[PDB]
Design a binder for this molecule. Structure first.
Ligand code: AU1
Ligand code: CA
Length: 419
């Protein structure tokens, strides 16, 4: 079977990853057929971290692009499409400096056009794209778009689809199929996939990614407490104020100050709860910050930093997280650890360790008070980062859309048998 290939660079706020996908030439339109062939993690920061030195943005991709030449067979280089899609890191930079944004985009374009792949552009995704393409990825890999049954006996209602929650470094997305009336066009999505219509809700909360939330909690802690109740007792660091306050997410809230943790789970909870404005809703129902959201429903996969954080809680802390009440207890126990106690659980490298308490607490509030999961809906949420040997994220769904590999309708409308 002759294989075709495709490459997406996911240029996220904190890192770039390259994914290489392969599929058989003559089965390319079947759902669930495309899979991941390989991947590469670019060393250092995301492309937006090179705003003041844009040529390094392109250079940073070279090691992974060299790997792609070895991963994809040589006779196939020229007809392999390559895409770069950039997310909230580049969206935040476009707020600060559209000129610096264009120069970063020009530097990666210039590097990518030097390679023999069919280079199809470097683009910034909208938040909607980001959310919807992650939802397409998860459901395509799990074959949720197959029409189940057979003639004279189709399953009814049709197979449910998996909602997607993506916790990135600078934004977070929530996307799910819904039968609720749409009250905000900015959230409303209609897809036509394999002959079927899917009514989907999506929203992207810019500045509610993990790294921007950790910055906002640091600015907040500095302002209200002059200690960090989410960091563990005995941990301290020298905080550079210009770094804290340069983000568009924190400029809302001495060059160096010392800041220490206090392991105070209750003050940590109070600090995180200030992130969610629930006072005002111009719609019949909101998530938070005045944003329209219909009731969460169906199964969900929570990936990226949702997965990594819960995996810390289950695997390193040894704590169960099957209910919202367990996840909340796991958070308190984590936040109550001292720095020596936390460090004694992690024999190897400790980067991110002081932050798990804050992120876990944000995730618990995001789900229960942001999105209004309760014990009943939360039971339908799985934390996973892979499906069918393929990393879950927006890259695959992006590549599928741009390469036109999901047909709106089946061939001949399958003789109309699905009508
Ligand atoms: N091992 C880990 N433990 C906890 N968090 C981890 C992790 N590995 C990556 N992450 C976090 O996932 C997030 C991935 O986000 P990105 O794709 O870089 N940000 P965006 O442009 O999608 O908004 C980062 O915050 C990263 O630090
Ligand atoms: Ca991301």
């Amino acid at each position: 079977p002759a294989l075709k290939y495709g490459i997406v660079l996911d240029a996220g706020s904190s890192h770039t990853s390259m994914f290489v996908y392969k599929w058989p030439a003559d089965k390319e339109n079947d759902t669930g057929i495309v899979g991941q062939h390989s991947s590469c993690d670019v060393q250092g920061g995301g492309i937006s971290s090179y705003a003041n030195d844009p040529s390094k943005a392109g250079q940073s991709l070279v090691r992974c692009l060299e790997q792609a030449l070895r991963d994809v067979p040589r006779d196939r280089h020229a007809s392999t499409p390559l895409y770069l899609g950039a997310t909230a890191g580049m969206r935040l930079l476009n707020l600060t400096s559209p000129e610096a944004t264009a120069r970063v985009l020009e530097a990666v374009t210039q590097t990518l056009t030097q390679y023999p792949f069919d280079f199809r552009g470097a683009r910034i995704l909208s938040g909607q794209d980001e959310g919807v393409f992650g939802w397409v990825t998860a459901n395509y890999l799990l074959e949720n778009f197959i029409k189940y049954g057979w003639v004279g006996r189709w399953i009814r209602p049709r197979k449910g689809t998996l909602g997607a929650m993506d916790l990135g470094g600078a934004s977070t997305q929530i996307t799910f199929e819904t039968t609720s009336p749409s009250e905000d066009p900015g959230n409303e999505v209609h897809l036509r996939l394999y002959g079927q219509h899917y009514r989907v809700y999506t929203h992207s909360f810019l500045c509610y990614g993990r790294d921007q939330i950790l910055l906002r909690l640091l600015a907040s802690a500095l302002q209200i407490h002059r200690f960090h109740p989410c960091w563990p007792k005995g941990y301290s660091t020298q905080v550079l104020l210009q770094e804290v306050y340069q983000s568009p997410c924190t400029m809302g809230q001495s060059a160096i100050v010392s800041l220490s943790g206090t392991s105070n789970a209750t003050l940590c909870r109070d600090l995180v709860s200030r992130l969610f404005n629930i006072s005002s809703c111009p719609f019949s129902q909101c998530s938070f910050n005045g944003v329209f959201q219909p009731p969460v429903a169906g199964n969900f996969i929570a990936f990226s930093a949702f997965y990594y954080t819960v995996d810390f809680l289950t695997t390193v802390m040894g704590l169960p997280v099957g209910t919202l009440k367990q996840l909340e207890e796991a958070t308190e126990i984590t936040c109550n650890q001292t720095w020596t106690e936390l460090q004694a659980r992690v024999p190897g490298q400790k980067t991110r360790l002081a932050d798990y308490c804050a992120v876990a607490m944000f995730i618990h509030q995001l789900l229960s008070r942001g999105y209004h999961f309760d014990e009943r809906s939360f039971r339908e949420v799985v934390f996973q980062k892979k499906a069918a040997d393929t990393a879950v994220g927006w890259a695959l769904g992006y590549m599928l859309n741009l390469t036109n590999l999901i047909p709106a309708d089946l061939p001949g409308l399958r003789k109309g048998t699905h009508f």
